Design a protein around this ligand. Structure first.
Ligand SMILES: Cc1cc2nc3c(=O)[nH]c(=O)nc-3n(C[C@H](O)[C@H](O)[C@H](O)COP(=O)(O)O)c2cc1C
Lengths: 246, 830
């Protein structure tokens, strides 16, 4: 036990070995994989990119006649489980409508901000991975109608959900696009003192370079934007947060 | 104007709206069938009683059809036509009876005997009703063939598939009497004619060859030792195959020429090859029996002449005792060696032939697969070989898992075939010339122009038609003495195969399926109606199925797992595999390594290098010390990056805080994408807990040997929609390594893994470049082993990465790792 216990950490910290002599230490290493460990301090990204490209270059030569153009493009490459087109669409949610089928119908076939925003099971709050609110909101139930405008042109596409507000049926959610990589889930409140509804912008960044979770929630002045909304509902002053609590 | 008429078997009933015109005779046959039908029992377990309303109606149809005479137009006929059409449009939803029968077996608590009793009833009822299958069936399979989306080849099984083979002929007679009972009696009288025709046939047929007598009355049926005797068995298997062909042609509603035209080629195993060429030449229903008489004749002669040259002899009762008392077969003139290569067996038979004289030397008869040979000779000499083979084999209940792969004792099986003649051995050579004098006697010769579809020779694999010499001479030469090179002859490109021969699911169909698993080609056993639980080969129903369940294609690995490329909006090129699709990063990962991937700075760097790495838990002791590590990763990485955690299974103390910690971080939502379990595979309950509680994306497992891989497969099956990275590594891996070879366990499991779409099969161990990994992405790495290509979804690098910039290994260690020369994959086990 004395001889053998704790026998690995020594190689990483040759300063805490008798002579700073590596020949004392135990280094785990694969006999076969020892044929390719020859260049020291080669950067991690240099090796990995160097293997991947070594792959891409071969596949391209063997299966695309060395023509890069032939490669199929996508919005973003990720978040596709290994289990397995009309513009002005409408969808009527019942109590019995399937969850998956409903979300596949919302997303559409083409890989675009919609596809991510309705199928990404997660989103990124800072570094944290919080469950997707857009899959929570468009969980199907009685009343809600989902209209899609410019549905075959992503950039212009705007999904509107509408629900029964006091017997009559009004729009609740307007998920649309701001500037290229900004998704505004404009959540509307109609039941107000003056009848003039209050629009909450739940902004989200859309990064296609993160194939896994391309949807991140905007948190800078996100409190301020919920404050501005609750300053319209509750307060009847002009909005100002620069007042001392004391 | 139709009055209701109800018929019941206890709780279950059916109703037919009988026209008030034909109500009296219907209501008369109603009480008649109700007094024939026995009392309802609990569970309906007993025989001769329906379990379902389809089976009840079927029995009614059968009972009615029995009272119907097809010559005389009776008052039973109009009600028969009314109740038959009622069954059809109530139960046969366009689909064939065989598909319905298959759904009854799959869904209901109906036995297979009940199903065969339903189907014979329906067919009987269909024939007496004066309603043949003149209409060309809408069977999905043949529809796809006609449209050119498929290609068929018909194979024909030979001797030694099964011992109890006569019970197939019985089953065909009993079930499809009304379809094949004309062929059976025609064959019967043809054999009877050939007995007293031939000078010395009556000698060998001691207990006669009145096949119709034994079929009609099972009591009269001789012992199986007489039935396996080749002069009887040969032509009778011939008749079994032809009867399976006719059944096929009739149910489809084609002529024997029309079905032959649908096929792109046909071949047989040994004496099935003769049926193939007889089926190759058939054209109409009328000129069918000219081809049959040819097939019967040739099969009768080869069976008589072979038996006369070398008959089975008295065997010493000591040898029979010794083979029985070691869980080995009764000696016979063929022995099947499974899980040994052709070269090994050739060496051992060369050793045997050394001592033995020329007259008793044994030679390899069939090469069924790469690792499945059959040696033929004298059963005493084949015992003398079986003794040599029993030395080398280790006990089946021996654990060699802890022994290095190449120092293990090679384990195989060796069982005697159920056959009564040394086919494809020098012992049957004298018969050759005698058969040709008998073949020319009956003028039973095949012309090249008469054959329309190609038939493949069993020895060289070439087409029969192209032979400039006598086709009858060559096909005799093939069956009696020339060895079968089965994988030479079966190298045709075809989308489907039809097994007609004997054996059902033990015969030739399943052997070909195993011998070209994963090349896409589907095998359908056309012999018997049954349910395959894995659905890795079809039964009769899939021929006659009219829904999309007919044209089921077997996965082709090369094309289904073809590594692709894709580009992002930014225009970065990813390798597109199963793995990469999920993670949305290149399909490489650096696996959890203690102490190299314990450093938060390394994990962070590699994550920020656009690759997937696992935080090694092995360097961490407390929930706190790990939590502080992770929060040092999270600080460094980019927003919406992720990294995995590599917990060892064998360290219980590590798991008891490690698992709950991850559960807390994931319930709070830290960027922990996945968990790897290194050194061990968890139990089904513990693995289920990790999946359904820790709320990961996927779960990595590192199986050490075959038993582990199996256990992984079980866990994936238990959670079909949850993705499961299988991180396979050999014994050649760095760190804690098993004794397993890198390659062989994947040859032996690639099939069984890929049948579960949620397993993301990652090859690892001995990788540091693209050149050495390319053939395992392409799949070609399996071609060296004589398999179809087997592409892998991803790759892990363990050793290669340890001389990186960001790994905290001390510079003089890095120098020492570099200075290691290393050895190729063949040497490492030193
Ligand atoms: C220093 C070192 C530490 C390792 N530590 C672990 C570990 O903690 N858990 C584990 O499952 N595998 C460990 N491995 C095995 C790797 O995860 C991987 O299976 C193996 O390195 C791949 O083989 P290769 O090293 O020949 O590439 C380690 C390997 C090395 C070289």
């Amino acid at each position: 036990i004395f001889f053998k216990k704790d026998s690995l950490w020594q190689s990483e910290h040759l300063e805490a070995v008798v002579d700073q002599d590596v020949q004392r230490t135990c280094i785990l290493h694969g006999p076969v994989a020892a044929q390719f460990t020859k260049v020291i301090d080669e950067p991690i990204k240099s090796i990995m990119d160097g293997i991947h490209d070594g792959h891409i270059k071969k596949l391209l030569h063997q299966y695309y006649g060395d023509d890069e153009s032939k490669i199929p493009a996508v919005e973003y490459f990720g978040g596709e489980s290994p289990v397995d087109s009309e513009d002005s669409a409408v969808f009527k949610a019942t109590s019995s409508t399937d969850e998956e089928s409903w979300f596949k119908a919302l997303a559409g076939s083409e890989i675009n901000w919609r596809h991510a925003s309705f199928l990404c099971s997660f989103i990124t709050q800072d570094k944290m991975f919080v469950s997707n609110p857009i899959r929570k909101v468009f969980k199907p139930s009685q009343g809600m109608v989902v209209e899609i405008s410019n549905g075959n042109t992503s950039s212009k596409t705007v999904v509107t959900l509408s629900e029964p507000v006091q017997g009559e049926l009004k729009p609740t959610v307007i998920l649309k696009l701001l500037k290229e990589n900004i998704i505004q889930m404009e959540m509307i409140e109609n039941r107000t003192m003056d009848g003039k509804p209050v629009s909450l912008p739940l902004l989200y960044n859309f990064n296609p370079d993160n194939g896994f979770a391309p949807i991140s929630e905007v948190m800078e002045d996100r409190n301020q934007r919920i404050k501005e909304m609750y300053w319209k509902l509750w307060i009847d002053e002009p909005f100002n947060l620069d007042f001392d609590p004391r | 104007s139709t009055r209701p008429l109800t018929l019941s078997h206890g709780s279950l009933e059916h109703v037919l709206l009988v026209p008030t015109a034909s109500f009296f005779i219907a209501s008369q046959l109603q009480e008649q069938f109700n007094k024939i039908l026995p009392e309802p029992t609990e569970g309906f377990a007993a025989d001769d009683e329906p379990t379902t309303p389809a089976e009840l109606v079927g029995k009614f149809l059968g009972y009615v059809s029995s009272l119907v005479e097809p010559s005389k137009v009776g008052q039973f006929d109009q009600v028969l036509n009314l109740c038959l059409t009622e069954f059809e449009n109530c139960y046969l939803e366009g689909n064939d009876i065989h598909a319905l029968a298959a759904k009854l077996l799959q869904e209901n608590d109906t036995t297979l005997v009940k199903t065969k009793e339903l189907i014979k009833n329906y067919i009987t009822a269909r024939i007496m009703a004066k309603r043949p299958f003149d209409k060309k069936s809408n069977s999905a399979l043949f529809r796809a063939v006609g449209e050119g989306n498929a290609q068929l080849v018909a194979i024909f099984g030979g001797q030694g598939n099964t011992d109890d083979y006569f019970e197939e002929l019985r089953d065909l007679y009993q079930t499809y009497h009304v379809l094949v009972g004309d062929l059976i009696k025609f064959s019967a009288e043809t054999l009877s004619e050939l007995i007293r025709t031939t000078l010395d046939a009556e000698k060998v047929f001691t207990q006669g060859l009145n096949i119709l007598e034994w079929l009609e009355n099972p009591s009269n049926t001789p012992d199986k030792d007489y039935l396996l005797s080749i002069p009887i068995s040969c032509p009778l298997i011939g008749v079994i195959q032809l009867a399976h062909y006719v059944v096929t042609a009739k149910l489809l509603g084609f002529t024997p020429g029309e079905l032959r035209s649908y096929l792109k080629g046909a071949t047989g195993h040994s004496q099935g090859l003769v049926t193939a060429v007889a089926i190759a030449e058939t054209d109409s229903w009328e000129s069918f029996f000219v081809s049959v008489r040819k097939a019967i004749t040739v099969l009768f002669f080869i069976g008589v002449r072979c038996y006369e040259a070398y008959p089975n002899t008295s065997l010493p009762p000591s040898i029979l005792e010794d083979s029985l008392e070691n869980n080995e077969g009764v000696p016979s003139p063929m022995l099947s060696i499974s899980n040994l290569t052709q070269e090994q067996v050739q060496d051992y038979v060369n050793k045997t032939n050394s001592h033995l004289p020329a007259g008793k030397q044994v030679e390899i008869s069939l090469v069924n697969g790469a690792k499945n040979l059959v040696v033929s000779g004298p059963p005493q000499s084949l015992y003398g070989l079986n003794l040599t083979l029993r030395k080398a084999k280790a006990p089946s209940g021996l654990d060699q898992s802890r022994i290095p792969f190449s120092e293990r004792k090679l384990k195989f099986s060796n069982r005697f075939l159920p056959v009564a003649s040394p086919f494809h051995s020098h012992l049957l050579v004298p018969a050759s010339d005698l058969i040709n004098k008998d073949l020319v006697k009956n003028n039973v010769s095949f012309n090249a122009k008469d054959i329309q579809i190609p038939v493949y020779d069993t020895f060289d694999g070439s087409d029969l038609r192209v032979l400039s010499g006598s086709i009858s001479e060559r096909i005799v030469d093939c069956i009696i003495r020339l060895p079968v090179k089965w994988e030479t002859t079966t190298q045709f490109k075809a989308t489907h195969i039809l097994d007609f021969g004997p054996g059902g699911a033990s015969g030739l169909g399943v052997l070909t399926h195993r011998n070209k698993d994963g090349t896409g080609v589907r095998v359908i056993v056309a012999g018997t109606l049954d349910i395959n639980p894995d659905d890795d080969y079809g039964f009769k129903q899939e021929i006659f199925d009219v829904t999309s369940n007919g044209l089921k294609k077997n996965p082709n690995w090369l094309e289904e797992y073809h590594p692709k490329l894709i580009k992002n909006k930014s225009g970065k090129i990813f390798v597109e595999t199963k793995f990469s699709k999920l993670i949305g990063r290149p399909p490489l990962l650096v696996p959890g390594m203690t102490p190299c991937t314990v450093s938060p700075d390394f994990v962070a760097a590699t994550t920020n290098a656009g690759y997937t790495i696992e935080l090694a838990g092995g360097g961490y002791f407390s929930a706190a010390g790990m939590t502080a590590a992770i929060d040092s990763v999270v600080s460094q990485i980019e927003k919406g990056s992720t990294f995995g955690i590599n917990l060892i299974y064998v360290n219980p103390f590590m798991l008891q805080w490690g698992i709950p910690l991850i559960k807390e971080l994931r319930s709070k939502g830290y960027p922990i994408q996945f968990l790897t379990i290194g050194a061990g595979v968890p139990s089904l309950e513990v693995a289920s807990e990790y999946i359904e509680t820790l709320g990961l994306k996927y779960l990595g497992l590192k199986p050490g040997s075959i038993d582990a891989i199996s256990q992984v497969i079980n866990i994936a099956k238990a959670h079909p929609n949850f993705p499961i990275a299988l991180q396979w590594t050999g014994g050649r891996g760095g760190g804690h390594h098993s004794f397993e070879d890198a390659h062989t366990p994947m040859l032996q499991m690639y099939s069984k893994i890929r049948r579960h779409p949620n397993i993301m099969l990652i090859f690892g161990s001995g990788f540091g470049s693209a050149d050495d990994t390319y053939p395992y992405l392409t799949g070609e790495w399996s071609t060296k082993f004589d398999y179809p290509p087997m592409p892998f979804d991803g790759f892990l690098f363990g050793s290669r990465v340890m001389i990186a910039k960001e790994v905290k290994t001390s510079p003089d260690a890095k120098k020492c790792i570099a200075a290691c020369t290393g050895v190729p994959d063949d040497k490492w086990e030193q």
